[PDB]
Amino acid sequence: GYSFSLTTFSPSGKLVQIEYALAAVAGGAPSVGIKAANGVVLATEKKQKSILYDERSVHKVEPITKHIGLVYSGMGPDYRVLVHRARKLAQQYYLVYQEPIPTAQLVQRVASVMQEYTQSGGVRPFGVSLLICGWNEGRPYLFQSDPSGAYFAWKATAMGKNYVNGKTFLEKRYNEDLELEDAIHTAILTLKESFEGQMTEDNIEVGICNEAGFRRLTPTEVKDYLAAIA
């Protein structure tokens, strides 16, 4: 292997490989996350190129534990690597402390993993950003982790293509007293703001966290919500 760093400092003080990874993130499919009073909603666009694609095969919304869920923007293979790492970390925490891991702890450990790839030898950063949802201590959590290894806590946020417009939309439409159904409607509206074509239950993917846990919505439920929106 190569023992030297591929990410170095520029004369202006920038780590330019991290910025190019962020450029990879900004070209990906849009993702939205909203924190309601009783839950969290993560929504993404999976617009396949052809009818030949079997929609039940690959999922962009993934469970990490019973109460933690993940979504991404950027490069998919890197996302799979990070999902495997996160699931292993949660299992190690459970084996040591006999408790399901808090969301913030998972975010911190995964962000450490992402930082390692900005300084290790012979590797590039991860070209993916992550939205993390959880329910701990009777309270919902939403976090964002970027290629550098930095994590932020959000009430609502958007990632991917047209994320600035999504941010303004969410600013205008977000409220503290939102309940989860209103949040789901708002998330689908944010995705509609930047969508080409007809939004069906098969080209978007939604997941929700509440007191019962994290679950991925079936296409039937998404069709019901889409009929409500339209």
Partner: protein, 255 residues
């Protein structure tokens, strides 16, 4: 392999370590952190770069980290590198407590971290850590202490100092207004608000843009406290009242 090697740990023809200088440039652009040492306490004051309306409050602080029962730090630069370094600082302190069964002195912790940071400038072919740190603490040998460290592995003890954006102007103001040996925590908080007022020129001073942490001794225990937004708003109101009074007395002289 030789073709792709960036050669981070070598000398320039002028004796300079270029990656360290570039990391110093990175620190010059981060959020401001000032530390002020008093007779009864020590304080850290940072500016918050996470000021979006859709951001959520959780945890304890954004830039202030608690390393021990008696020590705390504030970081400027790359945040992920800061997370790495603070984890390592906590580990060093707990290893000392295991070995000697006493709390670690502050300068020993700073020296250990600075040895780690010097290692990255001399061998390994990896990039340095782009983070400067301010440390505040209390130990039984020297009392209340304030230290600074930079990516080269250099550290120094200070009575008042600033790192980050516009730190030279802040240091000039501190040199002008710091009173040696006659400083209380209250007057230190006033001075911190004044310096942060002149350093945060891009946007004027509101409580949601600053965080203040205090270290004091009470009944033989060390207390580290992050000020609530109420107290910071009180401090800013006091600053504005004092400034208005000074302006009025300035307009008083001619009549």
């Amino acid at each position: 392999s030789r073709r792709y090697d960036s050669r981070t740990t070598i000398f320039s023809p002028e004796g300079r370590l270029y990656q360290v200088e570039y990391a110093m440039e990175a620190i010059g652009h981060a959020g401001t952190c000032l530390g002020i040492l008093a007779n009864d306490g020590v304080l850290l004051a940072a500016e918050r770069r996470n000021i979006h309306k859709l951001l959520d409050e959780v945890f304890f602080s954004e830039k202030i980290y608690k390393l021990n029962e008696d020590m705390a730090c504030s970081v400027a630069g790359i945040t992920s590198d800061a997370n790495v370094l603070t984890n390592e600082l906590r580990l060093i302190a707990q290893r000392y407590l295991l070995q000697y069964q006493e709390p670690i002195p502050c300068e020993q912790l700073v020296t250990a971290l600075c040895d780690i940071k010097q290692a990255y400038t001399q061998f390994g072919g990896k990039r340095p850590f782009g983070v400067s740190l301010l440390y505040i603490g209390w130990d039984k040998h020297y009392g209340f202490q304030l230290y600074q460290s930079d990516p080269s592995g250099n550290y120094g003890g200070w009575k008042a100092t600033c790192i980050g954006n516009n730190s030279a102007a802040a240091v000039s103001m501190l040199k002008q207004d710091y009173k040696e040996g006659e400083m209380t925590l209250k007057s230190a908080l006033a001075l911190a608000i004044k310096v942060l007022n002149k350093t945060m020129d891009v946007s004027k001073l509101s409580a949601e843009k600053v965080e203040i942490a205090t270290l004091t001794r009470e009944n033989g225990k060390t207390v580290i406290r992050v000020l609530k937004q109420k107290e910071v708003e009180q401090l800013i109101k006091k600053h504005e009242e004092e400034e208005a009074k000074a302006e009025r007395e300035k307009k008083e002289k001619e009549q």
